[PDB]
């Protein structure tokens, strides 16, 4: 993608550029050339269309521009997805959406079955730390309310 759409911060890119990094914007990996260990990365160059009526750009690969960069150690930093919780927690009744982040109500942050709560990073995605703190405090309030309503009756 382009520079102004980096999902992180903007001072970090300036610091990295000052420390000695070379960036290559709008490039997608196509293949790895080598024999037993990687020796280079053959990549292409994509082109971004204009923003649609909703706010999303469509990329298209340029057929002519293809290059190869010399690489001795490649590091994949694609992303992260949730794990298979219902099949790893012996409770296959957890309500779970497509991506894997389980579903909770907005007020009490309670999962499908009563008593079990879940809030934090497994609910949002690739969120930040302050979002996690907020989710944790909300889950704490909800757990306290539920525990009181339980212990009374």
């Amino acid at each position: 993608r382009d520079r102004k759409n980096m999902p992180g911060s903007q001072r970090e890119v300036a610091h990295a550029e000052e420390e000695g990094v070379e960036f290559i914007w709008q490039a997608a990996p196509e293949g790895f050339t080598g024999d037993t260990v990687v020796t280079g990365v053959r990549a292409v160059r994509i082109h971004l269309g204009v923003a649609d009526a909703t706010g999303r750009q469509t990329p298209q690969v340029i057929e002519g521009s293809e290059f190869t960069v010399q690489a001795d150690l490649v590091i994949k930093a694609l992303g992260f997805e949730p794990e298979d919780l219902p099949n790893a927690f012996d409770e296959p009744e957890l309500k779970v959406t497509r991506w894997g982040t389980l579903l909770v109500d907005h007020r009490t942050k309670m999962t499908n079955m009563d008593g079990v709560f879940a809030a934090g990073d497994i609910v949002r995605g690739a969120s930040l730390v302050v979002w996690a703190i907020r989710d944790g405090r909300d889950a704490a309030e909800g757990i306290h309310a539920y525990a009181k309503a339980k212990a009374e009756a």
Partner: protein, 1472 residues
């Protein structure tokens, strides 16, 4: 006026369809003709499906039992006056329906409301009833419809048997019904309240409203008809009825059976064109075909010789063109089979048709894009219909077929490829024809003796034949026709002189033959006719020729191919036969032809080579007419052909009339003999004989195309045998007996006079020794030749009288003029009153008469600046009006000079080219004028030679210095009478003070057209004659086109008095006025103002040199050179003296008769008597048809009202009420309103105010801006000036940005629309017609003829249609999409950029005057960059933004189109 249709795609009935149809009919009241009564309309109709539940409930209520199968209902118009003819009609209907076996349920009286019809549409109102027929036999539905059709046909025949009038059957079916009448468009659901019921639900609906040209409505003439609805007019109706009469004698189909005998006269009597086309359409549909196939066969597509279409479609169109003759004319059709619903266009695409698809499975098509109200968030695709396209809906399957998909689905039924290959061509046979057997050319003596027998002079070969062989194009003349008419001459005038050509007035546009040539064909087919109701291979086996004219070698090859199947007929009569030898010869040949055709012959060759010293040659026209008519009336024409070998054909007018009378092919061998004999003497130079013959045939073909194009007929097949001419000087009996369908208003010489002329000329040729042909004077004056209107002594006497200022010399001139033998129609008339003479000093003053004369328009291109200025100074001095003609005028003369002269012109013209029409040129006059046709050349554009266009005229017309300028024959703005009404509305909005004048040319049938344009709020009609001068025009159009003004004026006066419309308009005439006697006669016939023209030029020095086109006029009248313009000797005093003498003569005549004013004599026809030339000429001319005196009534016989005819007020009024601080202080404003398609000329009156206040360029760009939301109407912002910015959210209908003069128009889709901007039509037809400056940014696709006659505007659109940038003259235009065929036709100025992806521009462009390349200079890339950036900024598009984003890779996709004439004139060259 307007037609439209609505259809549910899935094919399920619902009330919304009928509701939307009624809503759409409720909103077309602005294109129709208003009336002072308010209740009188001229027609309306709707066509829907049968609501079975309604009629079944009615039948249950009566007491019967509702059947299971579908019920049938018929609607009938019975007589209303007599209560007995109703019973006879009912008896006939009931005894015919019960003859097949069906069960009749009963009759029902349709409830109506008569309180809303006018006074004239109510006196002829019929009694409306319905009959209910049920299918008890259990037969199928298709057989039910066939039986109902046969029943209706036989009922019509029966009721026509007993001569009962006012009977009609609007519909008889079990599927659809028609509600039509002569009420207003919006008052339909009030007259017929049944449609307000909740049970009327259908799955399709059609609606139509018309615009009549007379005021006598007849209910059975309103549309829609049974299975059709037509908007426009058909050109070839007199030619198609004949071929239908010929086809009827062989067609048969096993579906009808014996009842086929009751279907023989398929085209009834008393119908219109859209009724005849409908009848043939229905009889073709009922026999097995479907609506798309019948549409393809009747109104085909343009068989272009390009590779842009697959050859499957090519084979299909080839078969369809070979099977049937086309039905031409402007036409938008919305037809419906029992199953399909089709909407289609004609070959040229002159009428508009726009459609819209919604998400509810609904398609809505019509003439405007805002008739029904639809929210923008529910449309799927907007579109249009190109020329020849069509769009269909299949209801039985529920599918929507667009153009190409329908073509592909239709090209899969029959293997057309294996069928088409049965044809054979001719050039192959001419090649395999070995170059042996060339006969010997005739001897010089024989050639001369054969040429003298027809009256061919030496100027016929040195003036009109040498250019043909030399260059390949017809000659050019430079002055009007002043020769006597054919019947009043004394020399030998051939029979082809008595036939004048025809043309098309406002009701019908001509066709440009120089640019739109790709849609005109000259194919010919021998052995073509057959059964048109089968599908086999024998229908496509024939001989095919590429031109109806043939040389001698080609004719010999064709004869060898024909062999022993042809029959040669002699066409000579004995010179010693007697007084009735010609009649006996005609009978002999017309009997031998029938005897030979029945004997198995399939080719008739009419040769007259047997002409000798004892046998004269029958005129070929009369012979071929007799033979063709006899073959038509004997049911034999469909078997054979008719080839003619004539010895008189020399020019392109003879072949025209021979082919129009009915001949198939024409071979002229004497012209070829003369060509060969002139070549062997070494006159052409070095070109071979084959080159001469090729050039001659090319000239003949182009002349035929030009002659056939003056009417709108674009195919030779539908023009032959139609008789598109007018006979002047021939007997009524002879014309009605030998010629198929022509009018001869006044009678003429019979057969005896023709025999006398022929025999006398033959004796002169064969009884004396000829040594050389006579010199002959027909185009130029010679002492030996005929007489002329302008001779030497006349001219010199007039000039001396005008220079020396002596009334006696002018009286001598007038006497010399009025003492010659008769030469025109007004010479056989005589004035004779019965009162007593009055003293001369009592008649009106000379001033009050001089203020009735004007001078007609003479363009500054033809005249010199000095002569134009002199005429304008002279006329503005005495108080009368002048005219500027086409070509604009100089703005610097918009003020009186220091001495007191006024070099302006009180009447501005609006020509076809829109040559100088701006917003200030229209606000500096007192009367506007719409030139439809000129006196000399009708149905054709004015010409201007290349060298005549100097730098001054180039700047004056905004063109390229030194290039030929030919106006387009049509207007591109007047395609029907409603278009003329719209243009008159525009012209009355731009100038709130002027009067609109319409200029016509006399012919047959001009009365109805004049009565039509009188309802369009025009107040002055101009009837030009056939003898009007010109600056440049061909000879065939000068001598053989038009009619004397005495016929046209006398017909228009009567027709206007008959419709109670004469008291509203003023009549004006011109053409051939020389003395005061002619003025008094024209005033008696009905005219009120008079045009002089040529005589004025003679007062200033013109001596009839007739070299105006060559730019070397000696006296310097019509020249643009300097050293010749130094020889001008004109003076305004001369013109003043001429007009003074002319007025004094009229005063003298009026005093001699006994009246005291020109008002007392206007219309008084009884003061004119006819006197015969004598008892030795024996011409049976009866002028009584023009002497008929209709009684006016209580109104006067002339205009009795002051001021112009006012028009309803548009939106602009409100705007003028709001933008007051702009006119009082001059401050920026900003307004917003709502636009609707019933609001025409949005922003034109404001333009007039701004032009009058600040001028065309007084305000900065964007001083006042208006924001409209919705569908704007027609003529959006016409004639807007700089400082006005209209911004439309939605779409505009038509004529957007017409005559733009510096303003700004922005059109973009709404924000809440899910539509791709580059895939939906946003504007309509004829965009930026003749603009001179400004900008226009649209965010969609344009329509048809995009940016025609552009001169200074810069436009950016995301698409186009056919014939884009036609005849563009200046400015830049960017097109971000595909284009149509014939792109940049006749372009001669400017530049174009096209964003082409599929690499298809070389297939669509017309590479004749332009070159297309890739962009190579950065100076030209910066222009495109800035243009697209401004487009993105103004319209906020997304496609253009995407293009601008990827600039480096998309700059290599643009094609740059540059004219050929601007390759060495640009500052920065386009090459490296």
């Amino acid at each position: 006026c307007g037609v439209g249709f609505i259809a549910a795609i899935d094919g399920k009935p619902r009330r919304s369809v009928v509701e939307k149809g009624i809503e759409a009919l409720k909103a077309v009241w602005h294109r129709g003709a208003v009336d002072a009564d308010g209740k009188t309309g001229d027609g309306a109709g709707i066509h829907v499906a049968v609501p079975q539940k309604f009629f079944k409930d009615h039948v249950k209520v009566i007491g019967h039992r509702a059947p299971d199968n579908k019920l049938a209902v018929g609607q009938v118009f019975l007589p209303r006056i007599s209560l007995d003819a109703q019973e006879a009609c009912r008896c006939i209907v009931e005894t015919e329906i019960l003859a097949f076996g069906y069960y009749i349920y009963g009759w029902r009286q349709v409830p109506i409301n008569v309180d809303i019809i006018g006074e004239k549409a109510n006196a002829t109102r019929p009694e409306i009833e319905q009959i209910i027929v049920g299918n008890n036999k259990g037969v199928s539905d298709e057989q039910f419809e066939l039986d109902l059709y046969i029943i209706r046909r036989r009922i019509e025949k029966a009721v026509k048997g007993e001569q009962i009038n006012d009977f009609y059957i609007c519909s008889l079916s079990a599927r659809s019904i028609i509600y039509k009448g002569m009420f207003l468009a919006e008052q339909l659901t009030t007259f017929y309240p049944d449609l307000l019921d909740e049970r009327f639900e259908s799955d399709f609906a059609i609606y139509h409203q018309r615009y009549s040209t007379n005021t006598f409505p007849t209910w059975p003439l309103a549309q829609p008809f049974r299975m059709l609805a037509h908007n426009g007019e058909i050109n070839t109706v007199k030619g198609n009825v004949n071929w239908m009469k010929a086809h009827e004698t062989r067609m048969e189909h096993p579906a009808f059976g014996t009842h086929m005998q009751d279907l023989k006269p398929v085209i009834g009597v008393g119908l219109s064109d859209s009724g005849s086309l409908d009848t043939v359409f229905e009889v073709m549909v009922r026999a097995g075909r479907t609506a798309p196939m019948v549409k393809m066969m009747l109104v085909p597509q343009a068989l272009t010789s390009s590779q842009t279409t697959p050859d499957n479609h090519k084979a299909l169109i080839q078969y369809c063109n070979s099977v049937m003759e086309p039905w031409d004319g402007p036409a938008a059709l919305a037809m419906t089979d029992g199953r399909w619903v089709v909407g289609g266009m004609d070959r040229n695409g002159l009428r508009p048709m726009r459609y819209t698809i919604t998400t509810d499975g609904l398609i809505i098509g019509g003439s405007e894009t805002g008739m029904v109200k639809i929210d923008e968030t529910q449309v799927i695709e907007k579109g249009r219909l190109g020329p020849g396209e069509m769009i269909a809906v299949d209801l039985q399957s529920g599918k929507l077929y667009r153009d190409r998909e329908l073509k592909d689905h239709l090209a899969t039924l029959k293997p057309w490829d294996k069928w088409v290959q049965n044809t054979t061509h001719l050039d192959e046979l001419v090649k395999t024809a070995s170059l042996k057997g060339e006969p010997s050319d005739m001897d010089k003596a024989e050639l001369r003796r054969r040429q003298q027998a027809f009256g061919l002079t030496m100027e016929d070969m040195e003036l009109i034949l040498h250019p043909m062989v030399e260059d390949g194009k017809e000659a050019i003349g430079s002055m009007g026709d002043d020769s006597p008419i054919a019947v009043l001459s004394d020399k030998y005038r051939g029979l082809h002189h008595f036939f004048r050509q025809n043309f098309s007035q406002v009701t019908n546009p001509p066709i440009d033959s120089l640019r739109e040539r790709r849609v005109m064909s000259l194919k010919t087919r021998l052995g073509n006719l057959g059964n048109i109701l089968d599908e086999d291979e024998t229908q496509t086996r024939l001989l095919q020729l590429e031109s109806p004219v043939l040389t001698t070698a080609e004719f010999r090859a064709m004869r060898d191919y024909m062999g022993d199947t042809a029959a040669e007929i002699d066409a000579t009569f004995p010179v010693d036969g007697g007084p009735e030898a010609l009649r006996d010869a005609l009978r002999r040949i017309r009997q031998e032809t029938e005897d030979a055709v029945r004997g198995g012959a399939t080719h008739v060759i009419l040769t007259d080579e047997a002409m000798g010293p004892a046998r004269a040659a029958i005129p070929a026209i009369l012979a071929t007419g007799a033979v063709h008519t006899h073959l038509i009336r004997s049911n034999l024409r469909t078997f054979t052909s008719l080839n003619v070998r004539t010895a008189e054909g020399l020019d392109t007018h003879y072949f025209a009339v021979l082919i129009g009378v009915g001949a198939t092919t024409v071979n002229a061998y004497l012209a070829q003999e003369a060509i060969a004999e002139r070549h062997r003497r070494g006159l052409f130079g070095s070109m071979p004989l084959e080159k001469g013959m090729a050039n001659y045939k090319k000239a003949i073909d182009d002349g035929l195309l030009k002659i056939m194009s003056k009417m709108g007929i674009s195919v030779i097949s539908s023009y032959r045998g139609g008789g598109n001419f007018e006979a002047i000087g021939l007997s009524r009996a002879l014309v009605a007996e030998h010629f198929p369908a022509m009018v001869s208003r006044i009678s003429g010489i019979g057969l005896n006079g023709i025999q006398k002329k022929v025999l006398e000329q033959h004796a002169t040729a064969y009884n004396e020794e000829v040594v050389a042909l006579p010199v002959g004077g027909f185009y130029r004056f010679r002492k030996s030749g005929d007489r002329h209107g302008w001779e030497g002594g006349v001219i010199h006497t007039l000039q001396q009288a005008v220079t020396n200022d002596s009334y006696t010399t002018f009286k001598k001139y007038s006497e010399q003029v009025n003492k010659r033998p008769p030469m025109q129609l007004r010479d056989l008339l005589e004035l004779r009153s019965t009162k007593a003479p009055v003293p001369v000093d009592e008649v009106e003053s000379i001033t009050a008469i001089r203020k009735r004369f004007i001078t007609p328009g003479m363009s500054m291109g033809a005249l010199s600046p000095e002569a134009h200025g002199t005429l304008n100074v002279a006329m503005n001095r005495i108080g009368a009006k002048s005219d500027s003609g086409e070509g604009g005028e100089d703005p610097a003369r918009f003020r009186p000079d220091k001495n007191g002269d006024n070099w302006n012109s009180a009447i501005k013209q609006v020509a076809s080219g829109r040559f100088g029409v701006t917003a200030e040129y229209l606000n500096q006059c007192r009367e506007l004028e719409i030139k439809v046709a000129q006196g000399a050349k009708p149905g054709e554009g004015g010409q201007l030679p290349g060298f005549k266009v100097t730098e001054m005229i180039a700047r004056l017309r905004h063109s390229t210095p030194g290039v030929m300028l030919i106006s387009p024959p049509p207007h591109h703005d007047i395609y029907s009478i409603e278009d003329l009404a719209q243009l008159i509305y525009d012209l009355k909005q731009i100038n709130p003070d002027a009067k609109v004048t319409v200029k016509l040319v006399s012919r047959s049938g001009i009365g109805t057209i004049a009565a039509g344009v009188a309802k369009a709020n025009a107040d002055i009609i101009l009837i030009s004659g056939n003898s009007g001068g010109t600056g440049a025009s061909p000879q065939t159009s000068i001598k053989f086109a038009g009619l004397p003004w005495e016929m046209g004026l006398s017909e228009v006066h009567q027709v206007l008095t008959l419709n109670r419309l004469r008291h509203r308009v003023r009549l004006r005439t011109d053409g051939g006025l020389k003395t005061g006697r002619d003025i008094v006669i024209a005033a008696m016939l009905g005219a009120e103002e008079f045009g002089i023209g040529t005589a004025s030029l003679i007062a200033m020095g013109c001596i009839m040199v007739r070299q105006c086109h060559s730019n070397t006029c000696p006296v310097g009248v019509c020249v643009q050179d300097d050293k010749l313009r130094q020889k001008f000797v004109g003076t305004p005093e001369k013109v003043v003296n001429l007009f003074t003498f002319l007025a004094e003569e009229v005063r003298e005549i009026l005093a001699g008769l006994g009246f005291r004013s020109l008002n007392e004599v206007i219309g008084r026809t009884d003061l004119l008597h006819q006197v015969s030339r004598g008892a030795e000429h024996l011409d049976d001319l009866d002028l009584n048809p023009r002497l008929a005196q209709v009684d006016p009534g209580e109104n006067a016989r002339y205009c009795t009202l002051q001021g112009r005819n006012e028009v309803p007020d548009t939106l602009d009024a409100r705007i003028v009420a709001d933008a007051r601080p702009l006119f009082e202080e001059g401050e920026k404003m900003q307004l917003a309103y709502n636009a609707r398609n019933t609001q025409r000329a949005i922003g034109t009156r404001l333009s007039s105010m701004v032009t009058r206040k600040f001028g065309m360029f007084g305000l900065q760009p964007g001083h006042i801006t208006i924001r409209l939301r919705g569908t704007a109407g027609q003529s959006l912002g016409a004639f807007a000036v700089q400082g006005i910015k209209l911004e439309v959210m939605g779409d505009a209908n038509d004529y957007v940005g017409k005559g733009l003069s510096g303003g700004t128009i922005v059109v973009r889709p709404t924000t809440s629309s899910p539509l791709e901007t580059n895939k939906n039509t946003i504007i309509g037809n004829t965009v930026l017609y003749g603009a001179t400056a400004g900008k226009l940014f649209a965010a969609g696709q344009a329509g048809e003829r995009f940016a025609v006659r552009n001169s200074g505007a810069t436009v950016v659109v995301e698409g186009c249609g056919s014939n884009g940038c036609e005849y563009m003259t200046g400015g830049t235009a960017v097109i971000l999409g595909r284009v149509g065929d014939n792109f940049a036709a006749g372009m001669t100025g400017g530049m174009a950029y096209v964003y082409d992806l599929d690499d298809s521009l070389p297939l669509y462009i017309n590479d004749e005057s332009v070159i297309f390349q890739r962009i190579e200079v950065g100076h030209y890339e910066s222009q495109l960059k800035h243009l697209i950036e401004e487009h993105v900024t103004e319209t906020q598009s997304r496609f253009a933004a995407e293009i601008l984003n990827d600039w480096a890779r998309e700059v290599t996709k643009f094609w740059q189109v540059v004219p050929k004439e601007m390759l060495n004139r640009l500052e920065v060259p386009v090459h490296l």
